[PDB]
Amino acid sequence: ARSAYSYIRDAWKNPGDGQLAELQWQRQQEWRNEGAVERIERPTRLDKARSQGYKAKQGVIVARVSVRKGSARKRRHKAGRRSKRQGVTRITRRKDIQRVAEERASRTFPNLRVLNSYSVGQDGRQKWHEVILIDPNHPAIQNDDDLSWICADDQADRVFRGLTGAGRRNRGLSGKGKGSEKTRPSLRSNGGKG
Amino acid sequence: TSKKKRQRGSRTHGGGSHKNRRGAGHRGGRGDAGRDKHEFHNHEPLGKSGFKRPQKVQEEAATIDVREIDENVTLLAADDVAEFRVDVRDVVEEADDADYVKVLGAGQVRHELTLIADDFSEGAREKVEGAGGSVELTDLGEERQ
Amino acid sequence: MQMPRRFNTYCPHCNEHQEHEVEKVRSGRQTGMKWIDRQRERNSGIGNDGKFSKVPGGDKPTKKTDLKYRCGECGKAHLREGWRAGRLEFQE
RNA sequence: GAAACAUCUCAGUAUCGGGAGGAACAGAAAACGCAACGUGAUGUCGUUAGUAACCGCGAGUGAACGCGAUACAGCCCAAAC
RNA sequence: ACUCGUACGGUCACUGAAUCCUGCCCAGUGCAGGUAUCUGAACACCUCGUACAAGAGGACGAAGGACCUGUCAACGGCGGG
RNA sequence: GCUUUACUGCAGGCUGUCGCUGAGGACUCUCACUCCGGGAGGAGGACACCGAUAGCCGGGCA
Ligand SMILES: C=C1C[C@](OC)([C@H](O)C(=O)N[C@@H]2OCO[C@H]3[C@@H]2O[C@H](C[C@H](O)CO)C(C)(C)[C@@H]3OC)O[C@H](C)[C@@H]1C
Ligand SMILES: [Cl-]
Ligand SMILES: [Cl-]
Ligand SMILES: [Cl-]
Ligand SMILES: [Cl-]
Ligand SMILES: [K+]
Ligand SMILES: [Mg+2]
Ligand SMILES: [Mg+2]
Ligand SMILES: [Mg+2]
Ligand SMILES: [Mg+2]
Ligand SMILES: [Mg+2]
Ligand SMILES: [Mg+2]
Ligand SMILES: [Mg+2]
Ligand SMILES: [Mg+2]
Ligand SMILES: [Mg+2]
Ligand code: NA
Ligand code: NA
Ligand code: NA
Ligand code: NA
Ligand code: NA
Ligand code: NA
Ligand code: NA
Ligand code: NA
Ligand code: NA
Ligand code: NA
Ligand code: NA
Ligand SMILES: [Sr+2]
Ligand SMILES: [Sr+2]
Ligand SMILES: [Sr+2]
Ligand SMILES: [Sr+2]
Ligand SMILES: [Sr+2]
Ligand SMILES: [Sr+2]
Ligand SMILES: [Sr+2]
Ligand SMILES: [Sr+2]
Ligand SMILES: [Sr+2]
Ligand SMILES: [Sr+2]
């Protein structure tokens, strides 16, 4: 039958209706007063967490990040940068907020590696994401048959090289066919036209 | 002794006034510059013309002239010698991947031929029957209606 | 010059002779669903556009008479050239 | 560069910020669509092709499927119980 | 920043000690204020349109503008007959 | 380099609108949110702030 999990999930399908609506209105007040990276004992969205790879083990950390909202905060132009080149309040950046989050998080934890992240709400001027990080040095995880992969030296700073799932989903790598000619196998490998 | 070879001493290497062979000005602009002003002479006029049908909606038929067949009847010993009978499909190169094979009539037909192809031109027939011969439309070609 | 509302003339159709009216093209509006309503937003953004950032041009000291020759029995029309006329009166 | 110039080009180049490895990235289809009784992860090379497509439809820009090759290797969770 | 500051303040301009004075002009331009009426984008909204969408018309209507007033120690003007 | 009622844009100010945003064409409220207070608590209040968009002005700038 339905798993208790499928309930948490089925609820966040519309974080603005019912109990969850009352929760967020409350939590946020507390959230809005927390740092920019708060570690938390348990994931707010359990289904999602586990689903994304979470495990109630040793070395599996969760942290809620809070990034300022908006689009782009771009200066005008020092020298003589023409019209098509005067970006300031009408353009946005090529990296989505969740990626910014994942990064700030991994920095706060200079030894942990990003596993994944999820949204947990957003008031009128900031977005919150919980990021699942992992200690590649705790044997507790070095042994785990489902997570020991995140230990390869070539997984170091995996988030800063866009290896997160959201990382890849942003580098235009979702589709295996049409419209991904300039993305895969690498944006840089494609003279950045993706 | 090449031309280049004799240039040492010319100073201008054919150019003319040492003031000629300078920048892109001498060429009237880089590339197709002024292709419609000073160097407009002999430049397909400006504009858009007609349309194109999507590439995967295009039929490319493999064609051959009765003449080609006829000229090699005897040399095609590896084929039928009916009361000659030949399935063109096995004669045209580039056949394997052609939307279909069509026999175009052009030239004499000094033979009685039993040709078999996806489609023939109204003329290829005349030239075939008129040579005491028949022509057969492949099962495929049976979509002529 | 004026213009007889209904004169006897030929037409690139019935290979005969009937009566052709005189009506100055009332034209039509901007579809909104054309190849220019889309590339007007695609050839823009921030800065200039060239042909889209351009404006309408002047006119000659006169306007040729653009018409449409409708038919009697038929009901359809064709298109001929126009004449530089300050005005025009389709008499009756 | 467009023989000026704003879109366009130069060019996602120069330069800057962050990060990994001896290689990186990619990768086992919500694919393809020579529409098929067809192919079967991924890079890469030859070609497809200066083709399709874009574009003050100007100057210019410019793929892919397929094919021939190189090398080949497929798997693990979340949930149900 | 001004600012450990608060209109006897400090900001932004002009003229350039004292002394005698500092005329007329608000049409244009600027600034400010008002405004029946008119004009005035997008969203939501009504009608039609599309099994949806593109779309057509309507409706309401902000700042702004029209319009009206104030202002020249505000830009400036002080002629011809 | 500089100027402007040159062309084209951008900051920026003004304004409508959408989100933040809640309870009962004019109104009440308090609970988000903002400010004052050491605090208790006070003021303000779905406005303001911020994200987005739309119209006007826009040599301050390119
Ligand atoms: C006769 C002339 C006309 C035109 O052709 C040469 C050209 O047609 C034009 O410039 N304006 C036209 O306006 C009426 O019909 C169209 C045309 O295009 C407009 C867009 C414009 O091309 C770019 O901004 C438009 C808005 C699509 C408009 O829609 C009604 O160029 C010169 C002006 C030349 C003098
Ligand atoms: Cl990481
Ligand atoms: Cl074609
Ligand atoms: Cl007319
Ligand atoms: Cl195939
Ligand atoms: K330039
Ligand atoms: Mg034009
Ligand atoms: Mg030039
Ligand atoms: Mg590569
Ligand atoms: Mg030109
Ligand atoms: Mg390019
Ligand atoms: Mg393809
Ligand atoms: Mg002085
Ligand atoms: Mg304070
Ligand atoms: Mg300037
Ligand atoms: Na780290
Ligand atoms: Na792209
Ligand atoms: Na020379
Ligand atoms: Na083939
Ligand atoms: Na587009
Ligand atoms: Na030039
Ligand atoms: Na110049
Ligand atoms: Na262009
Ligand atoms: Na005045
Ligand atoms: Na004077
Ligand atoms: Na200078
Ligand atoms: Sr590191
Ligand atoms: Sr020469
Ligand atoms: Sr030179
Ligand atoms: Sr010309
Ligand atoms: Sr072949
Ligand atoms: Sr475009
Ligand atoms: Sr524009
Ligand atoms: Sr004239
Ligand atoms: Sr294989
Ligand atoms: Sr005045």
Q: Supply the DSSP symbol for A154.
A: G
Spell out the domains of chain B, with CATH numbers in brackets.
1-50 (4.10.990.10), 51-144 (3.100.10.10)
For residue C54, the ligand 1 atom closest to its alpha carbon is 24
* Atom of ligand 1 at shortest range from CA of C58: 35
Look at the block and give the residue holding tokens 């909606």: B57
Ligand 13 centroid vs B54 CA: distance in angstroms?
Answer: 80
Q: Do C47 and A84 touch (CB under 8 A)?
A: yes
Q: How far is CA A128 from the centre of its chain?
A: 9
Residue C30 labeled ligand binder = no
Residue A104 to residues A99, B95, C62: CA-CA distances in angstroms?
9, 62, 69
The set of residues, in sequence order, having a beta carbon less than 8 Å from that of C88 and lying 6+ positions away, is: C1, C2, C3, C24, C65
What CATH architecture applies to the domain A1-194?
A: 3-Layer(aba) Sandwich (3.40)
Number of folded domains in chain C? 1
- Output the CA C7–ligand 13 centroid distance in Å: 86
Domain ranges of chain A: 1-194
Bridge partners, residue A133, by sequence: A61, A114
Beta-bridge partner residues of B135? B115
Q: Return the number of other C-beta atoms located less than 10 Å from residue A86's C-beta.
A: 15
Amino acid of residue B23: G
**Partner-chain contact A91 C46, CB within 8 Å:** yes
C46 at A interface, C-beta within 8 A: yes
Written as six digits, the tokens of A32 are 């809005």
Nearest Cα to Cα of residue A166 among A135, A131, A127, A191? A131
Across B14-26, b (16+ Cβ under 10 Å) vs e yields: eeeeeeeeeeeee
Instruction: Name every chain A residue with its beta carbon within 8 A of the beta carbon of C46.
Output: 83-87, 90-91
Q: Which two tokens stand for residue C54?
A: 């351009």
Query: How far is residue B129's CA from residue A1's CA, in Å, rounded to a whole number?
Result: 77
For B145 and E10, how far is CA from C1' in angstroms?
95
Two tokens, residue A54: 């979470």
The CATH number assigned to the domain holding C27 equals 3.10.450.80
Is there a binding annotation on residue C48?
A: no
Cβ neighbours of residue B120 closer than 8 Å, sequence gap 6 or more: B102, B103, B104, B105, B128, B135, B137
Q: Does A90 touch chain C (CB under 8 A)?
A: yes
C2 is in an annotated binding site: no
B92 C-alpha to center of ligand 5: Å? 24
CB C6 within 8 A of CB C74: no
Instruction: State how far the Cα of A112 lies from the Cα of A138, in Å rounded to an integer.
Output: 10
The residue range of the domain holding C55 is: 1-92
Using a 7 Å cut-off to protein CB atoms, list the covered nucleotides of chain E. Answer: 54-57
Range 124-143, chain A: CB under 7 Å to any strand F atom: 124-125
Q: What is the DSSP string of chain B?
A: --HHHH-TT-SSTT-SSTTSS-STTTTTSSTTTTTTTTT-TT---S--------GGG---EEEEEHHHHHHTTTT-TTSB----EEEGGGT-TT-TTSSEEEEE--S---S--EEEESEE-HHHHHHHHTTT--EEE-TTTTT--
